[PDB]
Amino acid sequence: NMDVIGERIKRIKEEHNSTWHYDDENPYKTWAYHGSYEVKATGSASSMINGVVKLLTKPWDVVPMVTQMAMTDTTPFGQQRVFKEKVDTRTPRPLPGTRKVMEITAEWLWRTLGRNKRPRLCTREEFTKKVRTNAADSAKAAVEDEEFWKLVDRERELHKLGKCGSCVYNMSRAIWYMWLGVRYLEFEALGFLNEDHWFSRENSYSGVEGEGLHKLGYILRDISKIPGGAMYADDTAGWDTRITEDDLHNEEKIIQQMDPEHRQLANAIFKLTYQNKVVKVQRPTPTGTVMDIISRKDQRGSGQVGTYGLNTFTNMEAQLVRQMEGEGVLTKADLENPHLLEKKITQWLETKGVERLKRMAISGDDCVVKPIDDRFANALLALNDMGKVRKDIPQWQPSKGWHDWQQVPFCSHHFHELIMKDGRKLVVPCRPQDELIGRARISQGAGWSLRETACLGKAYAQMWSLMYFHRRDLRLASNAICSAVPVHWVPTSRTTWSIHAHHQWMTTEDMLTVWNRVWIEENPWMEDKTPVTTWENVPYLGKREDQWCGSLIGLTSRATWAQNIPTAIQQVRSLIGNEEFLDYM
Ligand SMILES: COc1ccc(CC(=O)O)cc1-c1cccs1
Ligand SMILES: [Zn+2]
Ligand SMILES: [Zn+2]
């Protein structure tokens, strides 16, 4: 294994020759440990609070979920704690019959996904334009430096020789350039999956990439129209740690559809940075903080470019395999059998595969499946054997599905169908309100001015106006924040890193105009394009549903906050200064 990872370790060991040592009391059990060197401690035990959002959400000062979200440890202690809990495990190898079905399904799936699209390399200019349309940060300075691109070229020459010298995953500027260079090279070889939307619903059938949060509920409602059993949405316990060496070899099959120059670079990413990997992790010791150099041959590196797409692929594959078991196509004897009959698997894929993909909504490890009947509930042999063990449920207990798409959890949300005053229906995203408020009350980092803090607050308020307008407390709090923040100040930073976020709230355009564009004009499930001319006509959840989903409506502390909110708005206004504000209440 040193033949692939040795050069990377040699360069780390040489760079840190001063403090390099082999800590014999290292905590790694399933990862190969190579050594340690001293570093400064990174991260914090708590998260900085957004004073603007906090001052305009007083009733949630006394809310347990809101307090918990403000915590979140990122220090070397936090890193070690999380590592021990999930990351330091071994997934048992799937049985020979399971490996055979997975291989047949993977080959068929890749051919289906590549029926109209051809893979291609992504470029320096694509990467640059992406870094630029994210910040104005140090990555934008690196991308603007020609010396960064020369290091990239030197690493690619090693990759073409089947070698790696600096692509290390992290759990002066030379180490930063090497990290960003590693990410660019991965982007160059596998970025086409995201850039060319291989996991769009049109291209993948099950996928939802590029759809956006506001379309997910409509997609779940369309799946509900398909004849069959209940809708199942089982959570896998730490999906990324369950990606096996067999999953990685099935994912690699996409290289067969690539041009030879692309294939060579993609093969280098697969073989040297996915199927073999070198990881840096901080650890507190009595003498200070150390960086550990570890390695392994499986699992998914969570921060990588290919993660989302490759998790989506393997989950689509795994769910088709589970659907086959439910239908009686795969038996317990088949999974144990190395010599299992390939014909019935092929016949099912070529005659039913696409129809079976249409019964699903898959986003990374998140899945919703509507099988042809409920035999699926108890079809767990292949799912557990592939290593995709469901979270917090005995291994052999049947899955519980839903007969109402509105109760189905998907991508941290559930979705409600609303009837507008004019009779039109909307399908809206929703989650426990405390999670929305709790997140909005967290600022990103330290040394942020009241201006930057107020602008992130505005970003959260405007996201609420567009996605969560149907929640009484969030429309009220959103109006309060937008009233306290100067009208012409542009929302800054980002409310989420979610692939489902299209950030339509990152503007100074009127939120009702933006609402109309998203929910009426551009909405393909809105046949009648009549615009909504007033927020008074923008609906809310039924009062009982709003309360079931965490609303404080009907409580006195809430009635008091609603009554006294102009006072809190004015307090924020007086501390911001003599700017142009607008009254939204
Ligand atoms: C599926 O969409 C999500 C899932 C999770 C989260 C939470 C977070 O990332 O902080 C946010 C979102 C979105 C908010 C607005 C548009 S997407
Ligand atoms: Zn490399
Ligand atoms: Zn809800």
Side-chain angles (χ1 to χ4, degrees), residues 1-181 183-286 288-585:
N1 193 268
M2 288 302 291
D3 50 334
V4 177
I5 68 166
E7 184 56 42
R8 263 166 292 190
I9 300 155
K10 194 183 154 286
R11 291 191 200 188
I12 291 156
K13 181 167 72 263
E14 276 177 7
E15 176 82 357
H16 306 275
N17 182 263
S18 206
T19 62
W20 186 264
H21 59 290
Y22 191 90
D23 189 327
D24 32 74
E25 281 156 63
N26 66 269
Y28 307 102
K29 320 296 174 199
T30 70
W31 291 76
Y33 163 91
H34 302 280
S36 311
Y37 62 88
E38 291 141 55
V39 281
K40 192 188 275 193
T42 252
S44 58
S46 302
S47 299
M48 206 204 123
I49 306 308
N50 187 308
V52 177
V53 185
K54 183 196 186 291
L55 237 188
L56 299 163
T57 57
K58 202 199 164 66
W60 294 274
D61 285 356
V62 293
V63 169
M65 178 56 71
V66 174
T67 303
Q68 175 72 209
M69 293 184 77
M71 297 168 78
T72 307
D73 195 2
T74 50
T75 65
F77 174 73
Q79 280 176 71
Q80 287 306 120
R81 228 243 300 105
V82 168
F83 196 98
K84 289 161 181 171
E85 279 162 13
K86 330 98 67 69
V87 189
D88 206 14
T89 53
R90 223 175 249 114
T91 296
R93 182 136 197 246
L95 286 163
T98 311
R99 300 179 331 243
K100 189 55 57 207
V101 191
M102 282 197 292
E103 193 161 26
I104 299 160
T105 311
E107 286 276 9
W108 174 95
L109 193 46
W110 276 132
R111 284 191 301 272
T112 305
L113 296 168
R115 76 193 180 281
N116 303 144
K117 297 172 195 287
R118 277 242 304 105
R120 60 142 183 124
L121 285 157
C122 286
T123 75
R124 149 182 188 173
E125 305 74 14
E126 266 181 291
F127 189 87
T128 291
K129 195 231 275 284
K130 276 185 92 77
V131 172
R132 286 184 203 275
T133 60
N134 240 244
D137 222 53
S138 66
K140 191 190 153 71
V143 125
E144 224 99 333
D145 181 4
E146 198 63 33
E147 295 301 290
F148 164 69
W149 294 110
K150 296 190 190 297
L151 287 152
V152 160
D153 300 336
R154 286 198 284 278
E155 189 54 38
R156 190 193 295 108
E157 292 315 313
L158 290 175
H159 283 198
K160 292 159 80 163
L161 258 20
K163 295 177 201 171
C164 194
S166 68
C167 306
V168 177
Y169 182 79
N170 278 78
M171 276 204 80
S172 189
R173 69 148 86 262
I175 57 108
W176 164 250
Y177 273 27
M178 271 156 63
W179 182 84
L180 196 70
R183 260 74 269 159
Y184 166 79
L185 288 178
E186 194 206 340
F187 172 78
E188 177 172 82
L190 296 174
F192 74 93
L193 294 169
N194 311 312
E195 298 321 302
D196 296 344
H197 315 287
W198 276 56
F199 296 99
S200 71
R201 193 144 194 93
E202 180 276 330
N203 194 61
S204 69
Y205 304 105
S206 300
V208 295
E209 195 280 335
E211 311 303 303
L213 179 62
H214 69 284
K215 298 206 184 173
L216 305 185
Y218 283 110
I219 289 161
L220 293 203
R221 186 180 73 172
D222 285 344
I223 295 165
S224 81
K225 294 170 207 303
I226 308 174
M231 293 173 74
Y232 296 86
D234 299 334
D235 226 83
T236 301
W239 175 278
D240 286 357
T241 76
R242 313 302 285 178
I243 284 297
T244 65
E245 298 194 48
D246 297 300
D247 295 332
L248 297 167
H249 286 266
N250 286 146
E251 289 169 359
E252 185 184 71
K253 295 179 183 291
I254 184 53
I255 71 162
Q256 288 158 42
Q257 300 173 222
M258 304 177 180
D259 300 317
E261 66 283 356
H262 182 192
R263 184 204 252 255
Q264 170 182 229
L265 292 171
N267 195 66
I269 298 306
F270 283 111
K271 296 194 178 297
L272 318 165
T273 83
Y274 289 178
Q275 292 162 22
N276 288 283
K277 57 184 140 297
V278 175
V279 176
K280 281 196 202 290
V281 49
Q282 281 167 71
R283 171 168 62 94
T285 53
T289 293
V290 291
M291 190 68 105
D292 300 315
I293 302 305
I294 55 169
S295 78
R296 81 180 294 147
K297 288 215 276 165
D298 62 12
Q299 306 190 352
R300 178 86 73 221
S302 309
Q304 287 163 336
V305 175
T307 295
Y308 177 79
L310 300 169
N311 281 347
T312 306
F313 179 84
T314 293
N315 200 11
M316 281 176 65
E317 177 197 302
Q319 304 308 322
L320 279 177
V321 170
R322 181 172 180 187
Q323 285 193 246
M324 280 180 228
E325 189 183 328
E327 293 175 40
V329 184
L330 285 168
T331 65
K332 181 171 182 184
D334 288 341
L335 299 165
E336 301 173 334
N337 190 0
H339 324 294
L340 131 90
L341 295 180
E342 298 179 58
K343 162 81 178 74
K344 62 167 176 183
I345 299 154
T346 296
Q347 165 101 308
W348 190 90
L349 294 166
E350 305 193 310
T351 62
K352 296 148 187 301
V354 169
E355 194 277 349
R356 300 299 193 269
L357 289 177
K358 299 182 174 168
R359 291 173 172 280
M360 313 194 287
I362 296 166
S363 184
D365 60 320
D366 292 299
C367 66
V368 173
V369 184
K370 196 184 186 303
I372 67 156
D373 52 65
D374 298 303
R375 282 171 303 166
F376 184 95
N378 236 320
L380 304 166
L381 299 166
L383 189 72
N384 287 141
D385 193 58
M386 287 185 290
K388 310 301 175 288
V389 180
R390 304 163 298 158
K391 194 201 246 194
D392 305 317
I393 188 164
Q395 248 186 227
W396 304 106
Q397 188 176 305
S399 303
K400 183 243 190 289
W402 290 273
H403 295 92
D404 184 355
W405 62 267
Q406 291 165 265
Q407 315 305 133
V408 175
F410 184 57
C411 297
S412 305
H413 289 78
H414 55 275
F415 305 82
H416 299 267
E417 182 175 84
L418 298 179
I419 300 165
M420 288 168 65
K421 283 177 181 176
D422 66 37
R424 297 180 289 175
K425 284 171 175 181
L426 283 164
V427 176
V428 295
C430 190
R431 60 189 297 174
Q433 199 176 257
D434 293 348
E435 288 166 23
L436 290 161
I437 290 169
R439 180 59 60 211
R441 287 170 55 129
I442 298 148
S443 191
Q444 269 307 111
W448 272 29
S449 57
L450 176 59
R451 161 140 207 170
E452 292 165 296
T453 297
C455 293
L456 177 55
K458 187 175 184 159
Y460 274 107
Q462 293 194 340
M463 183 179 78
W464 294 347
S465 297
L466 304 176
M467 301 291 157
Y468 314 102
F469 48 87
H470 55 270
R471 307 306 311 272
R472 286 161 182 83
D473 301 343
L474 306 184
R475 202 185 298 191
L476 201 166
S478 172
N479 283 339
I481 295 154
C482 296
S483 290
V485 177
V487 220
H488 301 121
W489 285 15
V490 186
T492 59
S493 192
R494 59 206 291 149
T495 59
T496 176
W497 286 92
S498 175
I499 84 281
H500 305 288
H502 295 177
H503 310 274
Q504 305 101 138
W505 49 89
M506 295 304 290
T507 190
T508 52
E509 192 173 18
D510 166 68
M511 280 311 113
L512 184 57
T513 304
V514 186
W515 188 97
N516 268 289
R517 190 178 300 127
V518 169
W519 295 98
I520 310 303
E521 312 169 20
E522 292 175 348
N523 184 351
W525 297 264
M526 189 56 87
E527 209 170 273
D528 174 2
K529 305 303 184 180
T530 304
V532 172
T533 53
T534 177
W535 281 110
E536 234 77 31
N537 293 151
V538 168
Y540 285 119
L541 287 187
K543 209 159 99 193
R544 141 202 262 203
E545 292 60 55
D546 205 355
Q547 288 176 330
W548 282 336
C549 294
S551 187
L552 298 195
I553 192 90
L555 305 191
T556 310
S557 75
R558 195 266 192 208
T560 300
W561 163 76
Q563 188 190 78
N564 300 336
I565 206 61
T567 304
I569 294 163
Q570 195 50 54
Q571 288 164 209
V572 177
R573 281 178 174 184
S574 65
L575 295 144
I576 279 169
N578 236 303
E579 301 284 348
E580 186 176 337
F581 302 95
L582 200 51
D583 274 84
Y584 293 103
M585 306 307 300

